[PDB]
Symmetry: C2
Subunit: 50 residues, 2 copies
């Protein structure tokens, strides 16, 4: 129950990150790694589909 | 299993978000919700401590 609530908030943070435009993302000190990780999540979500 | 891999990447994205300095975060169009959600994640992680 609680695990599910946490997963949902984590996914919500990831949804926000997905929608950050590149010109905004590039202003962040963590830009390179954030771009890498949001790309990795996108691929893993698709790979987990049957 | 690659659910574990997905959880790890989601957590990594959340860790990056957790460390964005406030002056950078406020440059993002999604700043208000990103602040709310990263606070909520901290609360849920703490609530799960047993």
């Amino acid at each position: 129950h609680m695990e599910q609530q946490l997963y949902a908030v984590m996914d919500d943070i990831c949804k926000l990150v997905d929608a950050i435009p590149l010109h905004e993302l590039e202003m962040l000190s963590c830009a390179k790694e954030l771009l890498l990780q949001r790309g990795l999540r996108r691929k893993l979500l698709a790979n987990a589909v049957d």
